[PDB]
Amino acid sequence: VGVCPFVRYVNMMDLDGFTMGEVEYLVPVASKIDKTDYDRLLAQHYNSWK
């Protein structure tokens, strides 16, 4: 081929080299939503009836 035959598809262009993906960038928010849903599930599983 003449060079390494691999071409890289970069998600975000950055001068610092940080190849950032949409998943690891938003982990805390998704985990926060999951924790809120878990709290609601616990509330309706343990404290939902008189």
Partner 1 sequence: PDRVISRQMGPFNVQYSQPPDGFFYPAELAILKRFKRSGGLMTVSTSRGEEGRPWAGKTAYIRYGDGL
Question: Which residues here bind partner 1, judged by CB under 8 A?
Answer: 16-19, 24, 27-28, 31
Nearer to partner 1, 7 or 23 (CB): 23
CB 6, min distance to partner 1, A: 16
DSSP helix/strand/coil, 22:
coil
Element (H, E) at 32: helix 27-46
Whether residue 18 contacts residue 12, with contact meaning beta carbons closer than 8 Å, is answered with: yes
Q: For partner 1, which is the closer residue by CB, 9 or 18?
A: 18
How many residues in total does the chain contain?
50
Smallest distance, Å, CB 41 to partner 1? 14
